[PDB]
C-alpha cells in the first residue's frame, strides 16, 4: 500500500496490509528485516528518515504511529495521540521531525530525536489526508477532504 | 552672589535603609561574625571565647572562633562615627551561620558586653527588635544574600592583609558621583580573608601592618568623612 526510498536509493522500504513493513536491497535484491507490529495491524502509509535509521508506518485500525529502528527490528515505541487513522507520514530532510496527517482533522508534528519528545498539533478544517513536505523542510502541504490544499510552516 | 536656600534651619538627614537603593551611601558589613545561641539548663546565653569554653568543646567547635566581643566593639566604633550622625551609612552583620542582620542607623547600641549579648539572644529568636517609640524596628534580620539588599549602583571591595595599600581618600574620590561604596570587612579573629570574595571583586588594603577588626573599619570610615566633606 505504500512504497518509499531512503539513503541514496540503495535501501528501500514498503508497507503492506499483511501486517509488516519490509526493507529491501537494490544491490542484493533481498530483505534485511521484516518489521512487524505487536499484533499485526494493517498499514496505510510509510515514511523514512533521510538517514537510514528509523522507519515508521500508519494504520487504519490501531492509528498509532509505530516506529522501528533499521538496525534492531524491534519497535521502539508507539507515537500515539490521534483520533482515527493516521493517513500519511513524512520525515523532514533537514530538521528530522515527522508530520502526521490524520482523520482527526489535526496535523501532528513529532520531534522524536534528542530528548525532545514533544507533540505539536496543527488542526485544520476537515479530514486531512495525503501530507507532503518541502525538501527545504520548513513547510507542510496537506489535502483536506473539503477540497482545499493548505500549506503551513513547521517551526512557526 | 548665589541665592540662599529658603529654609536655613538644620534638619535631620534621611535614614538610609535597604528599601531605598538610589542615594549615594556607605555600606559596611561585619562579615563572618560569630553570633550564635545555646541553652544552659533554664537560660539562654551567647557563646563567648572567654565565658564558657567547655560548652564549645562538647560542640566540637574551636574555642577561639566564637568571638562576639570584636563584633560588639566594631558596632560601637562604626555607629558612633560622625557619618552615622550625618546619616550617610548603614551597616549589616553577616554571621558565620548565614544569618544576615540589618542594623538601622538610628539604634542606640547597648554599651557593655553583657547587655549587648542580651539584646542579640532575643534578636535571633524574635527575628526583629522593635523601637521604644514604636516607629520602626531597629535590628531587622533580612533575607540572604547581601548583594540584592545593597544599593543598585554598587561597588564592592573587601579589607584584607595581602591586598595593595591605597589611600582611603583616593579610592572614594575616584569612585563615581552616584555609586554606593560597599566594604566587606572581616569581623572574625584570625584566618583566611575569603568570607565574601564571591561578592567583591578586588581586595583593598589599608596598611602593611596588622590592623585589628575595630581599627580597620575605623580607619576607612574616618577617611570617608574627610572625603565626603562633612
Amino acid at each position: 500500500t505504500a512504497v518509499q526510498f531512503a539513503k541514496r536509493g540503495q535501501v528501500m522500504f514498503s508497507s503492506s496490509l499483511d501486517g509488516t513493513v519490509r526493507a529491501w536491497d537494490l544491490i542484493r535484491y533481498r530483505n534485511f528485516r521484516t518489521f512487524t507490529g505487536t499484533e499485526r495491524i494493517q498499514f496505510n502509509c510509510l515514511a523514512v528518515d533521510p538517514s537510514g535509521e528509523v522507519v515508521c508506518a500508519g494504520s487504519l485500525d490501531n492509528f498509532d504511529i509505530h516506529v522501528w529502528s533499521v538496525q534492531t527490528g524491534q519497535l521502539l515505541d508507539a507515537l500515539s495521540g490521534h483520533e482515527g487513522p493516521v493517513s500519511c507520514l513524512s520525515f523532514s530532510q533537514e530538521n528530522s521531525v515527522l508530520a502526521s496527517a490524520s482523520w482527526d482533522k489535526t496535523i501532528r508534528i513529532w520531534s522524536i530525536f534528542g530528548r525532545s519528545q514533544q507533540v505539536e498539533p496543527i488542526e485544520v478544517y476537515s479530514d486531512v489526508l495525503a501530507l507532503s513536505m518541502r525538501p527545504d523542510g520548513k513547510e507542510v502541504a496537506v489535502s483536506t477532504l473539503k477540497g482545499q490544499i493548505s500549506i503551513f510552516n513547521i517551526e512557526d | 552672589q548665589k541665592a540662599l536656600p529658603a529654609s536655613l534651619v538644620p534638619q535631620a538627614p534621611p535614614v538610609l535603609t535597604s528599601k531605598d537603593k538610589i542615594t549615594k551611601r556607605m555600606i559596611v558589613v561585619l562579615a563572618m561574625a560569630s553570633l550564635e545561641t545555646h541553652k544552659i539548663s533554664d537560660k539562654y546565653v551567647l557563646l563567648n571565647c572567654d565565658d564558657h569554653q567547655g560548652l564549645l568543646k562538647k560542640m566540637g567547635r574551636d574555642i577561639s572562633e566564637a568571638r562576639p566581643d570584636i563584633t560588639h566593639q566594631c558596632l560601637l566604633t562604626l555607629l558612633d562615627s560622625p557619618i552615622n550622625k550625618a546619616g550617610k551609612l548603614q551597616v549589616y552583620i553577616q554571621t558565620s551561620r548565614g544569618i544576615l542582620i540589618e542594623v538601622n542607623p538610628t539604634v542606640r547600641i547597648p554599651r557593655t558586653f553583657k547587655r549587648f549579648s542580651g539584646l542579640m539572644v532575643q534578636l535571633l529568636h524574635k527575628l526583629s527588635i522593635r523601637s521604644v517609640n514604636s516607629e520602626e524596628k531597629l535590628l531587622k534580620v533580612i533575607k540572604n544574600p547581601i548583594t540584592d539588599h545593597l544599593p543598585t549602583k554598587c561597588r564592592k571591595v573587601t579589607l584584607s592583609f595581602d591586598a595593595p595599600v591605597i589611600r582611603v581618600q583616593d579610592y572614594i574620590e575616584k569612585l563615581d558621583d552616584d555609586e554606593s561604596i560597599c566594604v566587606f570587612v572581616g569581623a572574625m579573629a584570625r584566618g583566611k580573608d575569603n568570607f565574601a570574595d564571591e561578592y567583591v571583586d578586588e581586595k583593598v588594603g589599608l596598611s602593611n601592618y596588622p590592623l585589628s577588626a575595630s581599627v580597620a573599619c575605623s580607619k576607612f570610615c574616618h577617611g570617608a568623612e574627610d572625603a565626603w566633606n562633612i
Partner: protein, 213 residues
Amino acid sequence: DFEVVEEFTPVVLATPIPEEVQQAQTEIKLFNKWSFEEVEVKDASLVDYVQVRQPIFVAHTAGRYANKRFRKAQCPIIERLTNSLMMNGRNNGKKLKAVRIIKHTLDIINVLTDQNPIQVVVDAITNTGPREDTTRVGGGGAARRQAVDVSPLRRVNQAIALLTIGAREAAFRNIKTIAETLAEELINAAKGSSTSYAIKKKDELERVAKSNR
C-alpha cells in the same frame, strides 16, 4: 496620473460606527492611537525576537505561545510587556488590568516625548538587555564567576523582566501608581540615562562580567 478606484458606493452603515473606528481601517494601530509603521528596531540582534512587523490592535491575543520553545519570539513586545506584569502574588491573572495600565503608560510616554510611545518601548527594551552575563563554576568549591555571552532571546527576556520590576519596585509604597513609574522607567531606559533600574542593571551585570572575562 494613475488611479485604482475600488470603493464606489459611500460606505454608510445602518449601525452607526464612529469615525475614530472608520479611519483605523487603513492603518492597523495599537489601541487605535499609535501606528506600528516606521517602528524599526534601531539596535540590531533583537530583530526576530522583538517583533513589531505584524500590527496589533490590543495587547491581548492569547494564542499558543509557550508550548513550543522559541514561540515566545513571535510575541509583540507590547503584549509581552503586559503578560510580564504579573510579577507578584496580588496581580496574577488580571490582564484587563494590565492592558489598561499599559494603555495609560503609552499615553504618558507619548505626551512627554512626542515621537511614538511604541518606538520608545522598542528602543527601551533593546537598550537594557545585558549583553554580557556571569555564571558560577562548580569546581569542587572553586566557585569563581565566569563571563559568558547571552542569547538574543535571553536579552529580550531579561529586558522585559527588569523593566516591569523597575516599575513595580519604584511604586512599592509611594504616591505614584504603576502607570506613572513605568512611563518614567521606559523613557529613561530609551535614553540610556542611567537612572532607571533596568539600565542600572545593564552596566552592573556587564561590569561584573567585565571584571573576569
